[PDB]
């Protein structure tokens, strides 16, 4: 038998010396906890976010 994980796997080399700029936005929840989310420089940051 053979199957699939409903996905795909590749082998492109991972790099960290050249990465996109991140403008992290921090969201505060009603319960008082705060969570940070890194978004690209394109902005369009949503006013509300579903946290962890």
């Amino acid at each position: 038998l053979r199957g699939s994980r409903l996905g795909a796997v590749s082998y492109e080399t991972d790099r960290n010396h050249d990465l996109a700029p991140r403008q992290v936005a921090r969201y505060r929840t009603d319960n008082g906890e705060e969570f940070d989310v890194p978004f690209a420089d394109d902005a369009e940051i949503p006013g509300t976010w579903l946290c962890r």
Binding site: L1, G3, S4, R5, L6
Partner: protein, 146 residues
């Protein structure tokens, strides 16, 4: 005998909050894979069903409290939630086990590491290895000892 447990809980670095669960963790999906066999036949694991049982009831209770139903139905919902969590952790430890299609108890989180199979007995202390082979042997008298 009671002092044994009391001292175990005394200055042991852990609080007694652990025996009451305010939330339960979910195992990563790839450890409970949903895969499509060759020919379109899907395959899953029982852990998914046992998890859904916990979610569904947990949702229904949230409705019953929202609707302000009398305490009988809310109490029944809480009891079923308790039973569902118990089945998720150790299916069959209390009452009859929950069974899936056919007739077989659903494997729980405790059943995949306690029984004859499971990590502690199986998939540990032995496994298959690459760069290996096997074949029939015959006598060679022209060889040296090495």
């Amino acid at each position: 005998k009671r002092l044994k447990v009391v001292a175990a809980f005394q200055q042991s670095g852990n609080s007694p909050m652990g025996m009451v669960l305010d939330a339960v963790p979910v195992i990563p999906p790839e450890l409970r894979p949903m895969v499509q066999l060759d020919g379109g036949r899907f395959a899953t694991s029982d852990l998914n069903d046992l998890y859904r049982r916990v979610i569904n009831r947990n949702n229904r209770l949230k409705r019953l409290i929202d609707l302000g139903a009398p305490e009988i139905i809310v109490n029944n919902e809480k009891r079923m939630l308790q039973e569902s969590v118990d089945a998720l952790f150790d299916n069959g430890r209390r009452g009859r086990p929950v069974t899936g299609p056919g007739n077989r108890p659903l494997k729980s989180l405790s059943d995949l590491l306690k029984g004859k199979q499971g990590r502690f007995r199986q998939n540990l202390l032995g496994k298959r290895v690459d760069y290996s082979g096997r074949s029939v042997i015959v006598v060679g008298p022209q060889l040296k000892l090495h």
